[PDB]
RNA sequence: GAUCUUCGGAUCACUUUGGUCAAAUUGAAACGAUACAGAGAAGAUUAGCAUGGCCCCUGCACAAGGAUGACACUGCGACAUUGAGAGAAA
């Protein structure tokens, strides 16, 4: 009962929208705040620069 | 005005104003009240040092503290294919 007592585990663990053209727009801050903040964390770091700008020509350009 | 001296005529003295309101709700601290939640290190208890800034307070301080003051990410990818089979478009 050595393998078993590991995989038990596992299964265990594994067991366990917008409107208005306002309310958008808070969405669409809050998701700004959050990547200008990894950016701060993170002077470099090119997986949270690259992503940042195809996030904003999806929504403006 | 004062001193010389023809009643003319001299001579001395020369442009202020430290103002973020011209009369205490609506133009210069926030803290406090209340509610929730309620303190790092892979059992539980536990000292700490750092680390990085668009976070900051105490401090004469390039001492030291403030929970180790608090807060802190980790998919992508500069895309090859092989060889076979099936499908739709030229
Ligand atoms: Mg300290
Ligand atoms: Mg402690
Ligand atoms: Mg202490
Ligand atoms: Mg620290």
Redesign the pocket.
Same mark, same amino acid.
């Given at each position: 009962x050595x393998x078993x007592x590991x995989x038990x585990x596992x299964x265990x663990x594994x067991x366990x929208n917008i409107t208005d053209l306002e309310e958008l727009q808070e969405f669409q801050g809050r998701k700004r705040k959050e990547f200008?903040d990894?950016i @701060?964390?993170?002077?470099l770091?090119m997986?949270?620069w690259? @992503?940042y700008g195809?996030w904003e020509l999806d929504q403006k350009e």
């Open positions: 200008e990894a @701060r964390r993170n002077r770091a997986g949270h690259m @992503r195809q």
